[PDB]
Design an enzyme around this catalytic site. Structure first.
Site, PDB file in Angstrom:
ATOM      1  N   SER A 119       0.827  -1.201   0.000  1.00  0.00           N
ATOM      2  CA  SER A 119       0.000   0.000   0.000  1.00  0.00           C
ATOM      3  C   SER A 119       0.862   1.251   0.000  1.00  0.00           C
ATOM      4  O   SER A 119       0.740   2.103  -0.884  1.00  0.00           O
ATOM      5  CB  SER A 119      -0.934   0.001   1.209  1.00  0.00           C
ATOM      6  OG  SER A 119      -1.818   1.106   1.167  1.00  0.00           O
ATOM      7  N   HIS A 124      -8.613   2.490   0.818  1.00  0.00           N
ATOM      8  CA  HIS A 124      -8.823   1.943  -0.516  1.00  0.00           C
ATOM      9  C   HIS A 124     -10.304   1.847  -0.870  1.00  0.00           C
ATOM     10  O   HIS A 124     -10.733   0.895  -1.524  1.00  0.00           O
ATOM     11  CB  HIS A 124      -8.156   0.575  -0.652  1.00  0.00           C
ATOM     12  CG  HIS A 124      -6.695   0.586  -0.335  1.00  0.00           C
ATOM     13  ND1 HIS A 124      -5.815   1.475  -0.912  1.00  0.00           N
ATOM     14  CD2 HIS A 124      -5.959  -0.179   0.504  1.00  0.00           C
ATOM     15  CE1 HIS A 124      -4.599   1.254  -0.445  1.00  0.00           C
ATOM     16  NE2 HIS A 124      -4.660   0.256   0.416  1.00  0.00           N
TER      17      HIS A 124
END
Ligand SMILES: C[S@@+](CC[C@H](N)C(=O)[O-])C[C@H]1O[C@@H](n2cnc3c(N)ncnc32)[C@H](O)[C@@H]1O
Ligand code: SF4
Ligand SMILES: [Mg+2]
Ligand SMILES: [Mg+2]
Ligand SMILES: [Mg+2]
Ligand SMILES: [Mg+2]
Lengths: 326, 398
Positions: free
Chosen positions: A98, A215
């Site tokens: 990420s 996300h």
RNA sequence: GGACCUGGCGGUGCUUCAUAUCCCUCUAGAGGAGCCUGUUCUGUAAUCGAUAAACCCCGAUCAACCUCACCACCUCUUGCUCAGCCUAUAUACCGCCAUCUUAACCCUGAUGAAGGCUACAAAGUACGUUAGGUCAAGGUGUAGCCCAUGAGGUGGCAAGAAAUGGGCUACAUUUUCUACCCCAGAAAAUUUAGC
């Protein structure tokens, strides 16, 4: 054209791999101390002490974990370079989960430490503010063959509609490995999944210790700040094949990393597709070496679940202790 | 020559070019991949559950190839001429060679099962394309009565149902084979000897009714006239079918020289009226595929056929989609609707960079090999030809 | 009209068994996840169309700003060279694959239609065909456009949704790594065959 097995793939971890004691076993290695000095100069606080010895509650905050992971990943890259120069020399691909992308790009000569760290910081405060805006969370769900994910997200949404809320959010956020996913969104939907896993055919369920639903579109407020932080940055062409998370393919030209790095913030992480793109091959062909440069060993377990034969040649760089005092 | 470069232009009636794109031009008669109704496929597979092993695959392949390559029975006179030529140049043996041995197929139970498994889907696809012709060009037609000569498995009945089920009330199915009739009944009853028919009003007969008084809205003969043993039999059958035709007579055969020759004989027979004072005095014209009633320009050496792609019934041997190559002729009662009749594309259209090859059967009775390009023919006509395909119509005037 | 003979039912069932092919029964594996293809629907002025013609060389790959193909605009052209184009045709032939078709004698009955067996024996004995595919490891012709089916430029084009058909990867405790090559130490529903 070299046979695969003498090549190397560097995997960079993401949020959730923080631990008290990162850096010990990396400090004495060449060139790490000035990376942490630059971290102090850019951040405005001493990352080194917080990573070495901290309450772990200060380290678990979103604003603090991400810079810690970024700097620790780069320091581990330096350690690996010192121990095994050939591995860094013969590198074919790179991928981060990420925030590791910001590390991976920096490792690929596409970004510089100062600008990359600034971007990671701004991303961190922006995501913290977005999480504070609305209650939300992330839920790791391991399914069985009879489990249906889009379906379960749907009933999780009519639950919040019945309760009453504008456009409730519950969607698969992270593709990790077969039948294991991370859902993200409002906490009520995740409570619904936790309580009726039985009719959702979920073998295991675990709430992730995170600030908010990353996300997803809930992080939309954080897209515009980060974009600004990236306008000034001049991204070059990666020297190695750096794999993206929005669509799980190699970054082709410098002119698209700018917007892909912002789309990642509000798009699911395609980790399983990235592993497939990096490792999938015919039965019998050899796999490249894999090195997890950074804290933790989570990417190792994910790779074991995804591709066992690739996992056979996997190793992790120890960032907590060192065998020989350099 | 129905395309003179710089003179012919697209035919714009109902405000075509303005109100709808080129891919949907009225000559587009292409039918998407045909999939059989689920009841028919289920019934076929259930009826073949008894024996569908490796032997059945060979039997189906053999029967399909045998039917495809079967020639018309040779008439006495052709044998006489060949015999004279050979004698001028033992003769009987030389005639056994270089002459096709035409034999009657006796459809018993086993051969009926094999024929069903080999031809149900293909016949359905061909008949559906032929019926789509009428449906697409005359959407106000609502038939109430249908007869189908040589109704083998009921593919004609099923296609007619799928298209005109909201109006059809009587399906006459004629077939001399008791086994074929029994199989058609079972297929209509969901593959079981006891059940309720899926289509209502189906009558099964073993003999062809011969009477001009009874007249059907649609008369069909699909892959049937090639089973008849002689040209005299074909002639009498076609005469009867035309006499009993009310609106449309649809003849469908294999897409070979033999099938096309048979259909052109039938077309000429219907177009040249011999009966002095028939009960129905209306004249007949060719609705499709011919844009004219003149002799076929292509009967000399080649044939004329059309292709319909379809999904076969699932089997141990049917995996990929197939193409059904068939010859058709539809004869309609009355007179042509207008004088703006359009060429027919009788061959695959070949798309190449900035030009398109199309073979057209023009209204004047001639074949034209046209290479259409924007600069020569006009952007709109080029686009229409580009989107057109095999079996479609090209909307061109003057 | 009388007598007799061959027929024709490639008919129909019923009885028993030889009843091998074909059947079932039985045995052992094959559904999830992620990508790629086939068909449909919807949508665009348009092709999520192809690389003896790109890029990536760990493997493979997406769309690449390669280039070709498509859509909307334009420009040239007597030009490259009596120019230029896989444009068509094996629905021109030839090659290659595939489809289908391909007796005599002797006796008996009145020398009628006609019939001819008994073993411890009573007449019985002797090439063509195809609107077929293939222009990739091969050829000989024929036609097309030749102010454009040639050569360029400026923008776009980069689709969306399912149910089902298929393919590739990893999928473990009877496992995995090391040492050995077998007495060790650590880690953790149809379908495919059967013989
Ligand atoms: C083999 S099928 C052809 C396919 C069929 N028409 C269909 O649509 O499925 C043709 C049938 O016609 C029948 N047939 C042939 N001659 C006939 C005749 N003189 N009178 C009635 N039927 C006849 C045969 O029984 C044969 O099964
Ligand atoms: S070539 Fe023309 S005239 Fe001849 S059968 Fe075909 S459509 Fe009719
Ligand atoms: Mg060209
Ligand atoms: Mg070509
Ligand atoms: Mg051919
Ligand atoms: Mg495109």
């Amino acid at each position: 054209r070299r046979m695969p097995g003498q090549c190397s793939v560097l995997l960079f971890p993401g949020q959730g791999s923080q631990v008290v004691g990162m850096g010990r076993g990396l400090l004495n290695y060449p060139r790490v101390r000035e990376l942490y000095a630059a971290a102090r100069r850019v951040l405005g606080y001493d990352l080194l002490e917080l990573s070495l010895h901290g309450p772990q509650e200060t380290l678990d905050r979103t604003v603090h974990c991400q810079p810690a992971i970024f700097v620790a990943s780069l320091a581990a890259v330096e350690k690996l370079h010192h121990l095994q120069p050939s591995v860094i020399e013969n590198c074919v691909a790179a991928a981060g989960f990420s925030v590791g992308e910001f590390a991976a790009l920096v490792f690929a000569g596409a970004m510089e430490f100062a600008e990359g760290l600034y971007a990671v910081k701004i991303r961190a405060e922006a995501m913290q503010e977005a999480s504070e805006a609305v209650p939300s969370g992330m839920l790791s769900v391991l399914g069985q063959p009879q489990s249906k994910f889009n379906f379960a997200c749907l009933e999780a949404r009519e639950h919040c509609k019945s309760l009453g809320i504008e456009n409730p959010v519950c969607e698969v956020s992270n593709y990790l490995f077969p039948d294991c996913r991370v859902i993200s969104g409002h906490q009520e939907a995740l409570r619904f999944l936790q309580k009726n896993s039985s009719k959702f055919h979920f073998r295991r369920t675990r709430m992730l210790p995170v600030s908010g639903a990353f996300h997803t579109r809930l992080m939309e407020p954080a897209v515009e700040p980060l974009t600004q932080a990236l306008k000034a940055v001049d991204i070059k062409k990666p020297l190695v094949s750096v794999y993206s998370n929005v669509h799980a393919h190699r970054y082709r030209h410098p002119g698209h990393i700018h917007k892909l790095l912002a789309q990642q913030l509000v798009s699911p992480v395609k980790w399983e597709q990235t592993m497939h793109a990096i490792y999938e091959r015919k039965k019998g062909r050899g796999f490249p070496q894999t090195f997890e440069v950074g804290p933790g060993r989570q990417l190792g377990a994910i790779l074991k679940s995804c591709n066992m034969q690739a996992w056979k040649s996997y190793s992790a760089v120890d960032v907590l202790q060192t065998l020989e005092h350099v | 020559a129905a395309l003179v470069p710089g003179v012919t232009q697209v035919d714009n009636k109902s405000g075509f070019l303005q109100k709808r794109p080129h891919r949907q031009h009225p000559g587009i008669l292409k039918l998407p991949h045909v999939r059989l109704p689920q009841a028919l496929a289920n019934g076929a597979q259930l009826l073949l559950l008894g024996s569908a092993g490796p032997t059945m695959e060979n039997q189906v392949q053999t029967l399909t190839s045998y039917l495809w390559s079967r020639h018309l029975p040779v008439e006495p006179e052709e044998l006489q001429r060949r015999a004279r030529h050979l004698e001028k140049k033992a003769v009987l043996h030389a005639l056994r060679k270089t002459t096709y041995h035409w034999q009657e197929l006796s459809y018993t139970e086993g051969l009926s099962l094999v024929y069903m498994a080999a031809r149900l889907d293909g016949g359905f696809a061909a008949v559906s394309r032929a019926f789509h012709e009428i449906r697409a060009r005359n959407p106000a037609f609502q038939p109430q009565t249908l007869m189908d000569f040589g109704s083998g498995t009921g593919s004609v009945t099923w296609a007619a149902h799928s298209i005109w089920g909201q109006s059809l009330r009587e399906y006459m199915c004629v077939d001399r084979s008791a086994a074929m009739l029994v199989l058609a009944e079972k297929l209509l009853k969901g593959g079981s000897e006891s059940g309720e028919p899926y289509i209502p009003g189906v009558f099964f007969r073993q003999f062809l009714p011969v009477s001009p008084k009874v007249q059907f809205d649609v008369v069909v003969s699909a892959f049937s006239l090639s089973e008849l043993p002689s040209k005299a039999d074909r002639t009498e059958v076609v005469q009867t079918l035309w006499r009993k035709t009310g609106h449309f007579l649809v003849l469908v055969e294999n897409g070979t020289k033999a099938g096309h020759s048979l259909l052109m004989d039938a077309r000429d027979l219907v177009l040249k009226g011999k009966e002095k004072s028939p009960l129905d005095p209306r004249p007949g014209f060719v609705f499709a595929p011919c844009p004219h009633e003149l002799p076929c320009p292509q009967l000399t050496n080649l044939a004329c056929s059309f292709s319909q792609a379809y999904h076969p019934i699932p089997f141990s041997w049917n995996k990929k989609p197939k193409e059904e190559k068939f010859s058709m002729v539809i004869l309609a009662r009355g007179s042509p609707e207008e004088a703006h009749r359009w060429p027919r594309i009788t061959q695959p259209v070949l798309k190449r960079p900035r030009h398109v090859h199309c073979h057209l059967c023009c209204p004047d009775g001639h074949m034209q090999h046209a290479v259409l390009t924007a600069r020569r023919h006009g952007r709109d006509l080029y686009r229409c030809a580009r989107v057109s395909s095999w079996g479609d119509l090209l909307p061109v005037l003057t």
